[PDB]
Swiss-Prot record, chain A:
One example of a Gene Ontology biological process annotation: Mo-molybdopterin cofactor biosynthetic process
Enzyme class: transferase
Cited Pfam families: MoCF_biosynth, MoeA_C, MoeA_N
Entry GO terms, CC: cytoplasm; cytosol
Protein name: Molybdopterin molybdenumtransferase
Family: Belongs to the MoeA family.
Organism this protein belongs to: Escherichia coli (strain K12)
Pathway assigned to this chain's UniProt record: Cofactor biosynthesis; molybdopterin biosynthesis
Molecular function as annotated in GO: identical protein binding; metal ion binding; molybdopterin molybdotransferase activity; protein homodimerization activity
Cofactor binding summary note: Binds 1 Mg(2+) ion per subunit.
Lineage: Bacteria, Pseudomonadati, Pseudomonadota, Gammaproteobacteria, Enterobacterales
Keywords of the record: Magnesium, Metal-binding, Molybdenum, Molybdenum cofactor biosynthesis, Transferase
Function: Catalyzes the insertion of molybdate into adenylated molybdopterin with the concomitant release of AMP.
Amino acid sequence: LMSLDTALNEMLSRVTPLTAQETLPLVQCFGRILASDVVSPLDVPGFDNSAMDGYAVRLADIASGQPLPVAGKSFAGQPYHGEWPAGTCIRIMTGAPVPEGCEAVVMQEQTEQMDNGVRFTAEVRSGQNIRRRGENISAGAVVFPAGTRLTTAELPVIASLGIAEVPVIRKVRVALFSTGDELQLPGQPLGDGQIYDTNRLAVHLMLEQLGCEVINLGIIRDDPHALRAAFIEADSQADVVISSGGVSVGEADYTKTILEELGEIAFWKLAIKPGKPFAFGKLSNSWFCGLPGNPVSATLTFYQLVQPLLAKLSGNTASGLPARQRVRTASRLKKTPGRLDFQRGVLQRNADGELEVTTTGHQGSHIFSSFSLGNCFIVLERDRGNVEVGEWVEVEPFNALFG
Amino acid sequence: LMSLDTALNEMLSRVTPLTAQETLPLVQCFGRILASDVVSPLDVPGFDNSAMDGYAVRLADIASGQPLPVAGKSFAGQPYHGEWPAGTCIRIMTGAPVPEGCEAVVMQEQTEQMDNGVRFTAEVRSGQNIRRRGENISAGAVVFPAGTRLTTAELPVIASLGIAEVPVIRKVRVALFSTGDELQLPGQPLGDGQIYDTNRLAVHLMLEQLGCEVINLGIIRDDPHALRAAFIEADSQADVVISSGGVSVGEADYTKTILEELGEIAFWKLAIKPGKPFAFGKLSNSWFCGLPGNPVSATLTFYQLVQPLLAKLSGNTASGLPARQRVRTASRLKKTPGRLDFQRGVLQRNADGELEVTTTGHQGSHIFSSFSLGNCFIVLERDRGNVEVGEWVEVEPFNALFGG
């Protein structure tokens, strides 16, 4: 019934990004979100420097046609500061400051040795092989705006400005638990009718990799007093509280009366598969996301709704649902109109070098193993039906959460 | 002169994957390499159970056509063990075990509650809505082989088997350092021809995001005595030693002579762009990789060469290439034959829904912004010249090191 689109727009419209900040050296900032504009205090490069090894010259001396004796050498980190007489040149290495009065740098290839000094054999242009102060970044300019997620692409540039540390938004705090007397912890023996809990570890892992601060409360006892106490504890400690399974996503059980007693909760029926049910709303001090019990459904609902919620709350301004592309299927796909079906597939290059996708197998939410067998979603349109080999299909490669 | 391929193969053929192992709880295993096969001790699911909220019936009772009174209820984790008389049904919840003799589960909405019992309104087919013991995993089977990188796809399947911790290969230990009197620690004042050391941070970040244990020795003082000391420390404590800049990758100087004193090091000139020079070889107890000083070159060189080395060392049995595909350019590309040019580009969907790439801009190595602006490399073949709009082009999307 409710489109994924519409549901996510709704959830994000309710939410306001965190503003609370902390200051961290750059090496600890991978994947963190800049709280304030990074404004450069320096010109970069901060001084006119050689783009290569060769010789620093004045055009008037080149103009002579005469060989120029080498007055001195200039190293990166150890510039020449001796006298530079008229009619001479300076040997210079990549990255060294050009000497006062230098108008060009000639690479070795365009010179010959004379029994005396250096002949320049090619035209020498004003400014050739010189990187000028301020050509990359002007002091005073904003280099990265607030809301920028810091990776290897950004943090080295920040260091080239001489900044050792930056303010970033604190991590989003997410409390996490499951419930049901059928759920058991790994390493313990299974009682009557029990299964091992998997969703909660699947959610924890993903939160960790998303950079959140995870407060896992474990498996809560299927008792109203214990469950209430768990919600209250979760709420007091976190920005977001997630049930990885066991709390109602619509069914009229005791968990639903506790949830509604503690918050203002919507129970939605989404036009997706796998899954459909999702619970979302506001507790006293936190947002609540309630996932369906099936492992495929809970994982997919997490990945497609909760994941982007957390990106917005983190302060990230990257306006991006992950990347999709159009590719032909090498498999016949069973699909029923009425829901957007996030089937799992294997995307691969064929012998012609063209990109195609294969089903991973049975798509039932009775097996989590399609995530490991796969490397992408095949995102089958709400209204589309079965798909034949050769048709074009929307594909969404899995992110680093799945490898 | 030297192909990137020939270099990569040379580096990979030399190296032996680590086998040493340590056992960790599942929650601490993200991105770790599974050290032993995971074998299922149990059937998943463990028992025949309901796929719906409803009723568990036998087909003979359905065929009588009579309302069946509710004789009991089976809940998830609270199965029914009482008597199940003839002509009767058992209320059942999703995931609850089916009661003995059960032939079908009927979903609640295909029933009417009748005062003399539950009336079944639809056809009932043998086995409907029953998940069978072992239909996902069988006891005794290997679920993941040794060599699997563990992520969200694998670890929860491991949890489903009742296994709380697994053996993984120890992390690759990478020692790191730079040198040159030009280099200054950020947060300090820049003297005369100085710059802030950026390559070292870039490599530290990438190494940690790759799951390496990093030993950062700093900026090494630019003389032979301090350099020897740095090499001895680095080599004594690591599987791999990396110079992020300042140590020779071919030019004759004191750093070169120390390298040749302490190791068996090759200086390659690679048919690539950006970059070209790369130092590689064996120190007494470790492998060495020496990067060029230019940030664009170092970063590219680490990404295309050191990264695949670390993957093999780690024990990851994944095929190490590629995630490449062929896409049209929507940009004219300037490309000189003779080098494999890893231009940076922007991969985006056009209005027809087709994937296409655009240049980031100037492809010079004098700036670093192409890594921010870009989301891929346009991998232009060694012998190719200029590329016009609409030609086909190979493309390698950025991995998580640049944010995807």
